[PDB]
């Protein structure tokens, strides 16, 4: 049982920093992922990071532009979106994955999801 | 005397049978029902973060190629016939080392049915990895899982389900762990997607609650006794420099030995456990007691009475806060 | 040779004798060779045994020959065999040096004698409440893995009472006091009734120099603490050092003993004795502290000299009588 | 109901198939694409200088002898069909002991394709040697590699490449080492020349950073506390010969026990580790403290105050230099 | 170029050969001659009461079915031909775990002879149980045996004899045990009767004499030094209460640690060993020495001189009696 | 597209091939050339007197039955073809446990040549026994050998030689032993005669020099520090009976613990090692220091100054003699 | 990443001692090799030595004439060329090899190379 | 490298005691053997003994008549010849055998040999 709350969206024309706070049995779900869903398009994987060790992965589209890091003190995973593009207009979600739930890039492997923040540039 | 008739029937079934092809190849996926009869959980290892499980693993599926008529009986065949039959490629994802018992023969069962249903049972001893959160150790609660998945066949070719619903896994009451108790077990059926495709997943999870009885006697009681031992120096006269200093040294050294011994029986985790916090607190009290006499010796060349009431009171307060927080 | 070829040719290996009929009656016998290890930490014991299984297979009956056909282990793979397995075996294996230690002797009437030598590590549930003055009972359960009571029925052979060989065994730490062969015909595990043959043997832990080792340092530490009573009260560092050394050594002995034993949360009789000894050595140091505080007294030492040897003797009588 | 048609197709493929000959024997080398899905890294051993790795090892290559037509599907066959097919002689050069899981069947996957492409997957638990530089231990950084090479076929007969580029190896985030963290992983493709010939080499390397949290509590903190414990003798009056001498002895003896215990958990390397330097420095301070009282006792039969300000200051300076150098 | 002729000869021998039947089946028993070439005795374990033996096990017997003519040579065939030939079911009765080396091939030799004689050699590493009498430990003498017997064939079907008489077993001089010396070895041939029948038995026994050099330095010398250490308190003035009491405590505690350490390296036997008697005697002397000062302290609040002459004299007398009894 | 032609050629070679017969059976012995590519030496164990070796074992021999014409290429076949070919019965005489790696396939190579030459390579991890002379330990030099011999074929049937002379064994520089250094390696070819006959022997020997760096820090330095610690009692006034006696006891007890710890990490050999002599000498100095104060205490109820100059001088002289003798 | 600098060449008619200094991640490359390349001829292996243990190998042509030794204090590997011959006229290089890079005699197995010193007699 | 020197022969009509002194790497050759060679006849094995453990073997001809023992202090192996016979007229040699050199009875398995003493009765 993990609860995910994300905030820090809004509308800009730039650098933006999303955040996602987790609470509950975070030990059983050590992997946090970021997903965005364009209108009509299928939900797209953005990046994933582990709670322990800070190992991270990114998609090719957001590679070298988005940075993901977390702090275990606040149980918060934050996505830093820099050098925004008009293609980056989608609802950003926060998800958690089980230890033996498979690959990172597939949203169906994640059990708990956040509300979702709409970002338009 | 229909053994020849049964032999002819079985030979007909295996004539032209292709083990390389799953039942209903190229068509609907074959549903495989699974039930587990747990024999015992031999070991639970914190250092290796794994547990050893012995169980009877039964698989239930229908193969129309093996359907027979005219025999109103369930054919219980020799276990060696399984080599000429297709079996699911079931494997345990989180296991570290597993084997099938083979004395006096391989612990394997094949039981055919007139409609083509096949019952496949195996007695498997498996060592499955289980990551443990030792922050609240030894007052922690652990959730160890057993992941069951098909290796080669995707969800388009095979499907897994717990035969009997929540009653698929039995023998949980047979588990007798000296250090843990089985609070609850759960059955989970889901699909896991990899690059090769989506695969059916069956998960069996146990919630383990550690028993505090061993650790109270082994660790907590000696730590308290050493702390009480350091309080004896307060009643000793200040002129007995050798006696009071020796009491402070021995309690401090003994506390270190207890702390070192405990950390050698656990994996080298970076975070601080609950038991480590208690040992660190106990070390502070004994260290302050020796520092207390050093202050008394320094001023001399009332304080002892004040120390006789603060240290037992503060230690009792520390124990009350520690136990309430972790219970 | 022609008889052996004919029997194999018409033999259906995948089917038990008389399939779809009366269950096969399998006679079973055990010849225990040794019991190597008995680990309380691992709750297991290792046993090497000759397992003899006898049953009648009419498909192998031959004509005109009254001599039993003594065959090697290479003939084993051709015939049907009972799927006998040890229910409570953690691990087991066959001896294959210099060849597979298997025996098949075929009789003209169709009776098959099947003997194998196997070493098995068998789990034995042990209660350490009275450890080390404890008597343990260990089982050896034998059962058909796949054939229910409708197909295979087990029973101890008449020769079991003469070839068990449990009397000849020599154990380093235990002694086989009693043994029993039990048949349980009402055992059902998952589907169908599986008869179970069980061998129960009782092990009594030897009480000799082994228990002397654990109990004497406990006693000797208590005796050492008594020495401080005869030491003058003015010798503060001497009596304090004697008190602390006994207390610390007792603490380490409790820590070392439990650590060098199973991690089970069991209050063993040895642990109780350690607690009693720790109370006495701690009380001895408290006694001097009270005497020192009152001095800031020789009667207290004299009374302590009487009570502690007397009280320790009394508590030992209560302790030893209860567990023994 | 085209199982018979599929059976005829597969039997045709294996009719005349020679496992002794590689695809395109005598012609261009066969390109083998390799991907690794890391399951976990169970252990990292400094004493044995090796690590245990569990992974899904997939091999991709095209064999025109297995090409089939008329079936617009990918034939996922039983794992036992791999014995009748040619597979690359891939082995791990730096492994010490490896095996393929075989419960409930061998953890092996064969997936044919209409164009002749063959997918071969194995779940392998391997113990690979990894030489470690312990000069900066426990603040060291380690680089452990996994060498993949063909045993018999040279570069003229077989070629290796990472299928998917830098995305060939996945599951790195699944690695949960209590003592290490995966800083980075790299994929290297190269050719290695031996006397028998030149062979294709694939290398997978991880950079491991050790966690200092465990060693601070286990080793550094007790060493500091013992050093602080020796400073108590300065405040004790010089006439208390038994008390101050006992304080000096116990701190020195305790320091030796800590040093001996640490060196027993590590390989017998000849060079001095970073932790050894800290322990040697701590031993000097406690040894000098006992020598300080011997000087005080000798002159007696001001110095203590001068020792009260030099030893804590020098030890703090020693700690500052030590941590700056190794961080 | 008579390889074809030899191939025809060997194929003729194996045509119609029945491995299920022993030579001269139904007639006189087949005599099997056995020689052993001992390679080494790797370990002798008192805790497990077993020893590890590596040897070359040769078996000699005549099989007229394998007799060939026209080839005046001894056919040394590949070791894989033993699977098509009858071999004795020889097993070791007292072994605990044995195996045949298989690198680079199975360590097996087959050598046929024109008259039908078959030479069968195996390199076997075996762990054979050996019950040990530790009453005189470490000055004890052990007799470890290796029992050789046929498993299925009785004396009516097979017979065993040592080929070469007392020279059947060689390589005894190659045995280099750091803790034991091979005093003598014996060869015994006899018949053992079971319920199934009477079976031929070959027994190879070694008499091992333990070396006292290690135990003198490891155990006896430290015990003597501690006992001598306790005698120092006699020459210390009675007013030094802290010094003499500390001397008595440390010697007693050190003696207990030595006794506990020794018993942890040996099986938990109930009877008292020779070394245990020496340690118990040493503990009495140090315990009496501490009790001696307690008597001196009690009377004070001549005796020391009397103790200076009795304790060394009594301890020397105790040592003289102990060594004479066990030598 | 000559795969069919190659398949026909290979099938012709194996048609009528008899694995039971060596090449040129009944004629001249077959010469087998052997090269070793050392991968690593994982462990060197003094307790077990053995070392673990991983290597590539190549065997070269000519078999005219496998000669082929019309294909100007070296046929690199699958490793599974070795089961249908005759291979030498090469085994290691002094090995204790060996195996051939089998991931992802058996680490085996077969490479035929047009003239009939066969290249047979194996990756073998072997544990070979190596008796060690520990008289000069830890300043000793060890000579560990690897004996290579044919098991069944005598010198009349097979011959062994190092292919390439002194360059047959490579990879010696790859050996990275933390405790040893490879001074030299030698290749020896000879014949060994047994009762069955004379057999060809190949021997590979390494001379290992132990590194003293670990033992200086682990053992020699603590022993010196304890000896220096005992010298502090000389500067302490004689009236401090508790302090000086405690110093003597602790140094003696600590010396015993160091001596016991060292002997537990080594095999129970009866002879005295070089390190044992140093520890015995150090124990004498600390024991004499405690006896020195007992003499001082006895006469009291100048000597200390005499002890301050003799003990450091004698210990320095003892160290000088000890190091010169063993270097 | 290992940097190799070699010096000590020149022209002589004798005994000469080359040297090679290494810096960087020398632990990952414990084997140092010496190579020479005659004009037109392929690069020739001269000798190799390990950083730890001092184990060394030499070619037949330079056997018993060239000695190779190293000192870990300076991270320097030096080649001592004695009894020079007119055939020993080539550019001498310094190379480092990985732990699992294969045989010593093949220059392609070495990753990092020095500049190269020309020696003519 | 082991050097063997034997002495104590001469001519007698009785009891005689041969001796053999060893020096060098005696650890690598723990087995010492005695051989005699009659004129024209092949060299004959007499007896063998190990340096450590004192295990000994003898030939049938010299069994119960010749005794072999050694002392490690002097590194000497001595053969005591009692109840001499006219058949015991041969040159007696001293040999050392390697650890894995095979059987005792075969002189070719021994590496180092002594000079040899002629004994005639
Ligand atoms: C084949 O082996 C047999 C048996 O070992 C050999 O026959 C022995 O020959 C030796 C002399 O070399 C005699 O001392 C034995 O008495 C013989 N034994 C028997 C049973 O005959 C035979 O010489 C060998 N053949 C060859 C060609 O070596
Ligand atoms: C033996 O052989 C005869 C041959 O005619 C056959 O009829 C018979 O059934 C066989 N078995 C018995 C038990 O007679």
When CB atoms are compared, the residue of A27, A99, A109 closest to B193 is A109
Dist. CA C48–CA E129, nearest whole Å = 12
F196 labelled binding-site residue? yes
Q: How many other CB atoms are there within 10 angstroms of residue F28's CB atom?
A: 10
**D164-171: long-range contacts, CB 8 A cutoff, minimum separation 24:** D164/D35, D168/D34, D168/D35, D168/D36, D169/D35, D169/D36, D169/D37, D169/D38, D169/D204, D170/A103, D170/A104, D170/B195, D170/D35, D170/D36, D170/D37, D170/D38, D171/D36, D171/D37, D171/D38, D171/D39, D171/D55
Rounded (to 5) percent helix, strand, coil in chain F: 40, 30, 30
Q: Is A103's CB within 8 Å of B194's CB? A: yes
Nearest-CA neighbor of D26 among F68, F87, F64?
Answer: F68
The strand pair at G117-120 and G10-11 is best described as parallel
How is residue E88 written in tokens? 């004795």
- How many Cβ atoms sit within 10 Å of the Cβ of residue D35? 21
| Cα–Cα nearest to B94, from D174, D205, D59 | D174
B150 is in an annotated binding site: yes
Please report the sign of the dihedral spanned by the C-alpha atoms of residue F261, residue F264, residue F266, residue F269: positive
DSSP conformational letter for D231 = T
Three-state helix/strand/coil letters over E1-35? CCHHHHHHHHHHHHCCCCCCCCCCCCCCCEEEEEE
- Find, in chain C, the residue whose alpha carbon is nearest to that of E49: C36
Rounded CA separation C262/C257 (Å): 10
Domains of chain G: 2-119 (2.60.40.10)
CB pairs under 8 A between A and D: 27
Strand spans (E) along C9-101: 24-39, 44-56, 69-71, 84-86, 89-94
* Three-state helix/strand/coil letters over A54-74: CCEEECCCCCCCEEEEEECCC
* E118: three-class secondary structure by DSSP: strand
Cα dihedral across residues B264, B267, B272, B275: positive or negative: negative
**C-beta of residue D314 within 8 angstroms of C-beta of residue F254:** no
- Phi and psi at residue D76, in whole multiples of 5°? -90, 100
From the list D212, D263, D226, C217, the residue with the least C-alpha distance to B259 is D226
Identify any residues that bridge with H33 across adjacent strands, giving them in sequence order.
Answer: H48, H95
Residue/partner pairs of E307-314 with CB below 8 Å, 24 or more apart? E307/E234, E308/E231, E308/E234, E308/E235, E311/E230, E311/E231, E311/E234, E311/E285, E312/E231, E314/E285
Q: Which three-class secondary structure state does DSSP give residue D140? A: coil
**What span, in angstroms and rounded, lies between the C-alpha atoms of D55 and B279?**
39
Which experimental technique did the depositors report for determining this structure?
cryo-EM
Signed CA dihedral, F242, F248, F252, F258: sign only? positive
Distance CA E196, CA C67 (A): 15
Counting from 1 in the atom list of ligand 1, the atom nearest the Cα of E72 is 27
E115 lines ligand 1 (CB under 6 A): no
For residue E114, the ligand 1 atom closest to its alpha carbon is: 1
> B247, B232 in Cβ contact below 8 A?
yes
Work out the burial of residue F213: count CB atoms within 10 Å of its CB; fewer than 13 is exposed, 13-18 middle, 19 or more buried: middle
CB H46 within 8 A of CB H93: no
Nearest ligand for residue F154 CA: 1
DSSP strand E in F93-250: where? 95-100, 108-112, 117-129, 141-150, 158-162, 169-170, 180-193, 198-210
Integer Cα distance of B54 and B62 in angstroms? 26
Strand, helix or coil for residue B318: helix
Q: Residue B184: beta bridge partners?
A: B207
The answer to whether the CB of F238 falls within 8 A of the CB of F207 is: no
C-alpha closest to that of A32 among A45, A42, A43, A41: A45
All residues at 6 or more sequence positions from F234 whose CB lies less than 8 Å from its CB, including other chains: F289, F292, F304, F307, F308, F311
Report how far residue B296's alpha carbon sits from residue B306's, in angstroms, rounded to the nearest whole number.
Answer: 12
Beta strand F158-162 with F30-45 is parallel
Q: How many CB atoms lie within 10 A of CB D44?
A: 22
d(CA F263, CA F260): 5
Distance C279 CA to ligand 2 centre (A): 85
Q: How far apart are CA D164 and CA A60, in angstroms?
A: 13
Min distance H96 CA to chain E CA atoms (Å) = 13
Query: Which contiguous run of DSSP H or E holds residue C117?
Result: strand C111-123
In chain G, the N- to C-terminal Cα span, in Å, equals: 34
Closest-approaching ligand to the CA atom of F157: 1
DSSP character string of D294-307: HHHHHHH--HHHHH
Containing G60, the helix (H) or strand (E) segment is: none
Residue in chain G lying closest to F170 (CA): G103
Spatial neighbors of D264 by CB under 8 A, at least 6 apart, are: none
Does the Cβ of E73 fall within 6 Å of ligand 1? Answer: yes
- Cβ within 8 Å, pair G103-F172: no
Radius of gyration in angstroms for the set of CA atoms belonging to chain B, rounded to a whole number: 31
Question: Side by side, which strands form the sheet with E180-193?
Answer: E90-92, E141-150, E198-210, E180-193
CA C163, chain centre distance (Å): 21
CA angle, A89 then A74 then A12, to 5°: 20
F191 shares contact with chain G (CB less than 8 Å): no
Can you read off the two tokens belonging to residue F306?
């005499």
Q: How far apart are the first and last CA of chain F?
A: 69
* Crossing angle for the helix pair E221-230 and E303-325, to the nearest 10 degrees: 170
Q: Tell me how far apart the alpha carbons of residues E239 and E105 are, in angstroms, rounded to a whole number.
A: 78
Residues 6+ apart with CB under 8 A from D273: D134, D135, D136, D137, D138, D266
Are the CB atoms for G72 and G51 separated by under 8 Å? yes
- From residue D128, alpha-carbon distances to D41, D51, D97, E172 in Å are 11, 6, 7, 40
Residues 6+ apart with CB under 8 A from B148: B34, B90, B92, B93, B160, B201, B202, B203, B204
Q: By C-alpha distance, which of D235, D240, D308, D303 is closest to B299?
A: D235
Q: Are A31 and D173 a contacting pair at CB < 8 A?
A: yes
Which residues, listed in sequence order, are joined to residue E66 by a DSSP beta bridge?
Answer: none
Q: Measure the CA–CA gap between D165 and B275, rounded to whole angstroms.
A: 47
Q: Cβ-count burial of D278 within 10 angstroms (0-12 exposed, 13-18 middle, 19+ buried)?
A: buried
The DSSP bridge partners found for residue D4 are none
CA A23 to chain centre: 15
Backbone angles phi and psi of D137, in degrees to 5: -60, 140
Question: SS3 for F197?
Answer: coil
- F9 and chain G in contact, CB less than 8 A: no
In chain D, which residues have their Cβ closer than 8 Å to the Cβ of A52?
176, 181
**G27 secondary structure, DSSP code:** T
The residues with which E191 forms a beta bridge, in sequence order, are E200
For residue F40, how far is its CA from the centre of ligand 2 (angstroms)? Answer: 67
Contact D255/D223 with Cβ under 8 angstroms? Answer: yes
Which ligand places an atom closest to the C-alpha of E115? Answer: 1
Nearest CA to E287 among C227, C309, C212?
C227
Q: DSSP character for C60?
A: G
The per-type count for chain A, helices as H runs and strands as E runs, is: 0, 11
The CA–CA distances, whole Å, from D196 to D151, D153, F103, F135, G104 equal 10, 10, 21, 43, 14
E-to-F residue pairs, Cβ atoms closer than 8 angstroms: 165
Residue E280: other Cβ atoms inside 10 A: 15
Provide the sign of the torsion angle of the four alpha carbons D18, D21, D26, D31, taken in this order: positive
Instruction: Sort B213 into a burial class: Cβ within 10 Å, 0-12 / 13-18 / 19+.
Output: middle
Closest CA to E119 of E189, E231, E33, E195: E33
Question: Encoding tokens for residue D183?
Answer: 């800083």
Helix (H) or strand (E) holding G85: none
Q: Please give the Cα distance from A32 to A92 (Å, whole number).
A: 13
- CA distances (Å), origin D219, targets B226, D215, D224, D262, D270: 22, 5, 9, 8, 21
| Residue B120 annotated in ligand binding | no
Tell me the chain F residues in contact with residue D271 when contact means C-beta distances shorter than 8 Å: 213
C70/E257 Cα distance (integer angstroms) = 59
* Angle at alpha carbon of residue D243, lines to D242 and D246, rounded to 5°: 80
Q: Both tokens of residue D161?
A: 């490449």
Find chain D residues with C-beta within 8 A of G112's C-beta. Answer: none
d(CA D241, CA D306): 19
* H or E stretch covering D129: strand D117-129
> Where is E165: in which H helix or E strand?
none
Tokens read off for A50: 């582990």
Q: How far apart are CA C167 and CA B297, in angstroms?
A: 71
Q: Coil, strand or helix: which one is E186?
A: strand
The token duo for B305 is 């009475």
- Shortest CA distance to G110 belongs to which of G121, G96, G99, G93? G96
E260 Cβ below 6 A of ligand 1: no
Count CB neighbours of C168 within 10 A.
Answer: 10
E270 closest CB neighbour out of C37, C206, C217: C206
Ligand 1 neighbour E74 (Cβ under 6 A): yes
**Which token pair is C151?**
């197909």
Chains C and A: 3 or more CB pairs within 8 Å of each other: no
CA angle E41, E42, E46 (to 5 degrees): 90
Residue C275 tokens read as: 């607690």
**Nearest C-alpha neighbor of F121 from the set F132, F106, F133:** F106
Structural element, H or E, at residue F156: none
Helix (H, G, I), strand (E, B) or coil at E40: strand
Give A-chain residues touching D182 at CB under 8 angstroms.
Answer: 53, 55
**How many Å lie between the alpha carbon of B208 and the closest alpha carbon of chain A?**
14
Name which of G10, D163, E104, A16 is nearest F93 in CA terms.
E104
Is D57 annotated as belonging to a binding site? no
From residue F54, alpha-carbon distances to A65, B320, F171 in Å are: 47, 59, 11
Does any ligand 1 atom lie closer than 6 A to the CB of residue E111? Answer: no
One DSSP character per residue, F267-279 reads ---SSPPHHHHHH
Structure tokens of F231? 């010298």
Question: Buried (b) or exposed (e) across E197-206, using 16+ Cβ within 10 A?
Answer: eebbbbbbeb
The span from the CA of C207 to the CA of C173, in Å, is 9
Interrupted backbone of chain D, residues before each interruption (C–N > 2.5 Å) = 301
Q: Is E76 in the pocket of ligand 1 (CB under 6 A)?
A: no
Q: For A67, left (φ over 0), alpha (ψ -120 to 50), or beta?
A: beta
Using the atom order of ligand 1, give the atom closest to the CA of residue E73: 27
Contacting residues of D for B87, CB less than 8 Å apart: 104-105
* Whether the bond into F104 is cis, omega within 30 of 0: yes
**Quick check: CB of E207 below 6 Å from ligand 1?**
no
Question: E156 at the C interface (CB within 8 A)?
Answer: no
Nearest to E93 by CA among E125, E128, E58: E128
> Entry resolution in angstroms?
2.9
Q: Give the span between the Cα atoms of F305 and F296, in whole angstroms.
A: 11
E135: β partners: none
Residue H100 and residue F143: Cβ atoms within 8 Å?
no
- Residue D214 phi/psi, 5-degree rounding, is -65, -40
């Amino acid at each position: 049982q993990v609860q995910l709350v994300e905030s820090g969206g809004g509308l800009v024309q730039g650098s933006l920093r999303l955040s996602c706070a987790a609470s509950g049995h975070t030990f059983n779900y050590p992997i946090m992922g970021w997903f965005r869903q364009a209108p009509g398009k299928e939900r797209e994987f953005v990046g994933a990071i582990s709670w322990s060790g800070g190992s991270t992965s990114y998609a090719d589209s957001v590679k070298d532009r988005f940075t993901i890091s977390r702090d275990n003190a606040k149980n918060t995973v934050y996505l830093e979106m820099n050098n925004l593009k008009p293609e980056d207009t989608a609802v950003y979600y926060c998800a958690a994955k089980g230890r033996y739930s498979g690959g990172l890039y597939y949203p169906t492997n994640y059990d708990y999801w956040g509300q979702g923040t709409q970002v338009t540039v | 005397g229909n053994m020849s008739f049964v032999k002819e029937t079985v030979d007909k079934l295996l004539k032209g049978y292709d083990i390389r092809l799953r039942p209903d190849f190229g068509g609907p996926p074959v549903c495989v029902g699974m039930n587990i009869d747990i024999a015992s959980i031999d070991m639970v290892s914190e250092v290796n973060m794994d547990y050893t499980l012995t169980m009877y693993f039964q698989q239930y599926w229908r193969d129309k190629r093996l359907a027979y008529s005219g025999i109103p009986l369930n054919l219980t065949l020799d276990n060696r016939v399984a080599d000429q039959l297709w079996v699911p490629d079931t494997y345990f994802l989180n296991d570290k080392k597993s084997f099938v018992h083979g004395v006096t023969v391989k612990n394997r069962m094949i039981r055919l049915h007139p409609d083509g249903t096949v019952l496949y049972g195996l007695r498997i001893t498996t060592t499955a990895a289980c990551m443990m959160d030792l922050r609240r150790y030894p007052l922690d609660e652990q959730n160890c899982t057993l992941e069951i998945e098909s290796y080669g066949y995707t969800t388009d070719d095979i499907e897994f389900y717990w035969r009997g619903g929540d009653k698929a896994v039995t023998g949980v009451e047979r588990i007798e762990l000296p250090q843990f108790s089985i609070v609850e077990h759960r059955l989970v059926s889901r699909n896991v997607v990899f690059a090769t495709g989506a695969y059916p997943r069956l998960s069996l999870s146990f919630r383990l609650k550690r028993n505090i009885g061993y650790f109270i006697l082994q660790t907590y009681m000696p730590s308290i006794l050493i702390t009480i031992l350091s309080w004896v120096s307060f009643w000793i006269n200040y002129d007995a420099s050798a006696a009071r200093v020796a009491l402070g040294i021995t309690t401090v050294l003994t506390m270190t030995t207890i702390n070192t011994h405990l950390r050698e029986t656990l994996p080298k985790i970076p975070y601080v456990k609950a038991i480590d916090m208690y040992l660190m607190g106990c070390f502070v009290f004994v260290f302050l007691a020796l520092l207390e006499y050093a202050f008394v010796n320094y001023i001399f060349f009332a304080i002892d009475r004040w120390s006789r009431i603060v240290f037992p009171f503060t230690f009792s307060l520390f124990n009350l806060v520690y136990w309430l927080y972790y219970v | 040779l022609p008889n052996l070829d004919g029997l194999i040719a018409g033999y259906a290996r995948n089917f038990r004798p008389g399939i779809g009929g009366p269950p096969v009656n399998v006679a079973l016998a055990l010849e225990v060779a040794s019991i190597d290890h008995i680990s309380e930490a691992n709750m297991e014991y290792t046993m090497t045994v000759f397992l003899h299984q006898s049953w009648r297979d009419s498909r192998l009956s031959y004509n005109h020959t009254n001599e039993t056909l003594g065959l090697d282990s290479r003939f084993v793979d051709k015939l049907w065999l009972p799927d006998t397995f040890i229910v409570n075996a953690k691990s087991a294996w066959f001896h294959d040096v210099t060849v597979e230690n298997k025996l098949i002797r075929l009789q003209p009437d169709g009776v098959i004698l099947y003997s194998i030598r196997i070493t098995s590590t068998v789990a034995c549930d042990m209660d350490l409440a009275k450890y080390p003055m404890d008597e343990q009972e260990c089982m050896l359960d034998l059962e058909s893995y796949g054939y229910s009571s409708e197909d295979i029925v087990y029973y101890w052979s008449e020769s079991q009472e003469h070839i068990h060989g449990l009397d000849k065994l020599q154990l380093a730490q235990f002694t086989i006091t009693s043994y029993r062969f039990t048949t349980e015909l009402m055992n059902f595990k998952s589907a169908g009734q599986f008869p179970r043959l069980s061998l129960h043997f009782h092990l009594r832990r030897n009480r000799g120099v082994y228990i002397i080792q654990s109990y004497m340092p406990s006693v000797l530490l208590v005796a050492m603490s008594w020495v401080s009573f005869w030491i003058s009260q003015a010798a503060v560092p001497a009596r304090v050092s004697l008190g602390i050394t006994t207390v610390l050594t007792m603490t380490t002995l409790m820590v070392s003993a439990r650590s060098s034993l199973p991690r089970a949360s069991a209050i063993k009789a040895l642990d109780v004795y350690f607690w009693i000894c720790y109370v006495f050595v701690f009380a001895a140091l408290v006694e001097y502290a009270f005497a020192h505080f009152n001095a800031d007294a020789d009667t207290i030492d004299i009374y302590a000299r009487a009570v502690f040897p007397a009280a320790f003797a009394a508590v030992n009588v209560i302790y030893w009588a209860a567990y023994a």
